[PDB]
C-alpha cells in the first residue's frame, strides 16, 4: 500500500495472509472454511500443498497473538483466467476458522450491486510502501481509494479496453495512495450503506500511485454464481 496508514488485524479481521516460507498474497475470509483471493497469485505454483494461510495476523514475518494457521485443502483457480488479468479470482478451502475479535468473515455483495462511482472504499495489504522499495512492510497497512466509473477507466489515457465490465477501478483523487506489488488478492471493502461488503479483490495496475493509472480490482458482484457453485 502506497500512502495510507498502518493497522492491526482488528481493523480488517477477514484479512488472510498467504505464504508459500515466503509471502504470496492477501485474501479475504468469506466463510469459516473459505478464503477468496486472486488466481494470478497461484498460477506459477498450482500445488495446494505448497501454501500456508494465516488468519488474525497483523505482522508479515512475526506471529500475531491469537493467529490461526491453516493448510490449503483445496486450491480453486478460475478456469477462464487469462493475462491486465481477466477472471482474476481464486478460492482456497482452509483446514476451519474460529471467529474471534481478530478473525471474522466479510459479507459478499448482492448480484451486480456495486457502490456508485466516487464512493470511498478501503484496501488492505502487506504490499510495498513505495514502488522503488525492495522490502515489504512488516506491519499491515490500509488506505482509502475512490471508485471510478468504467467510462473513465476505459479511456485510452487510462487503460483503454484493458479494463472490462468484470473489473472495477479505484484511485485517489490526488493519485497519492494506491495498492502496489504484494497487495494482490487483498480486499477492496465498501459500505453498501449498512454493511461492510467485499466489493473487489486487488488484481492489477500499471505501476502504483501514478496519474491516470488506477488500481484495478476483480468485480466480486459479477462472480457470485462461480463463488456459490464452488463453495
**Catalytic annotation on 40?**
yes
User: What's the total number of domains in the chain?
Assistant: 2
**Catalytic annotation on 44?**
no
Are 50 and 146 members of one domain? no
Which member of 28, 37, 40, 78 is catalytic? 40
Which member of 28, 85, 86, 88 is catalytic? 88
**Catalytic annotation on 184?**
yes
Are 130 and 23 members of one domain? no
Which member of 37, 58, 179, 184 is catalytic? 184
Are 123 and 197 members of one domain? yes
Are 217 and 138 members of one domain? yes
Domain range enclosing 207: 1-12+106-221
Are 203 and 92 members of one domain? no
Phi and psi at residue 31, in whole multiples of 5°? Answer: -165, 160
Amino acid at each position: 500500500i502506497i500512502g495510507g496508514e498502518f493497522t492491526t488485524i482488528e481493523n480488517q479481521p477477514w484479512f488472510a495472509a498467504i505464504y508459500r516460507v515466503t509471502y504470496v498474497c492477501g485474501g479475504s475470509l468469506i466463510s469459516p472454511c473459505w478464503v477468496i483471493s486472486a488466481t494470478h497469485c497461484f498460477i506459477d505454483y498450482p500445488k495446494k500443498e505448497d501454501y500456508i494461510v494465516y488468519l488474525g495476523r497483523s505482522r508479515l514475518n512475526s506471529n500475531t497473538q491469537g493467529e490461526m494457521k491453516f493448510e490449503v485443502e483445496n486450491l480453486i483457480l478460475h478456469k477462464d483466467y487469462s493475462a491486465a488479468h481477466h477472471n482474476d479470482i481464486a478460492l482456497l478451502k482452509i483446514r476451519c476458522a474460529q471467529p474471534s475479535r481478530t478473525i471474522q468473515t466479510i459479507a459478499l455483495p448482492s448480484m451486480y450491486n456495486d457502490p456508485q462511482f466516487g464512493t470511498s472504499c478501503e484496501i488492505t495489504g502487506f504490499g510495498k510502501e513505495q514502488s522503488t522499495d525492495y522490502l515489504y512492510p512488516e506491519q499491515l497497512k490500509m488506505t482509502v481509494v475512490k471508485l471510478i466509473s468504467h467510462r473513465e477507466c476505459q479511456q485510452p489515457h487510462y487503460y483503454g479496453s484493458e479494463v472490462t465490465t468484470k473489473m472495477l477501478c479505484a484511485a485517489d483523487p490526488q493519485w497519492k495512495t494506491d495498492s502496489c506489488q504484494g497487495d494482490s488478492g487483498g480486499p477492496l471493502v465498501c459500505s453498501l450503506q449498512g454493511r461492510m461488503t467485499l466489493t473487489g479483490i486487488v488484481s492489477w495496475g500499471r505501476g502504483c500511485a501514478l496519474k491516470d493509472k488506477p488500481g484495478v480490482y476483480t468485480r466480486v458482484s459479477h462472480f457470485l454464481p462461480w463463488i456459490r457453485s464452488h463453495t
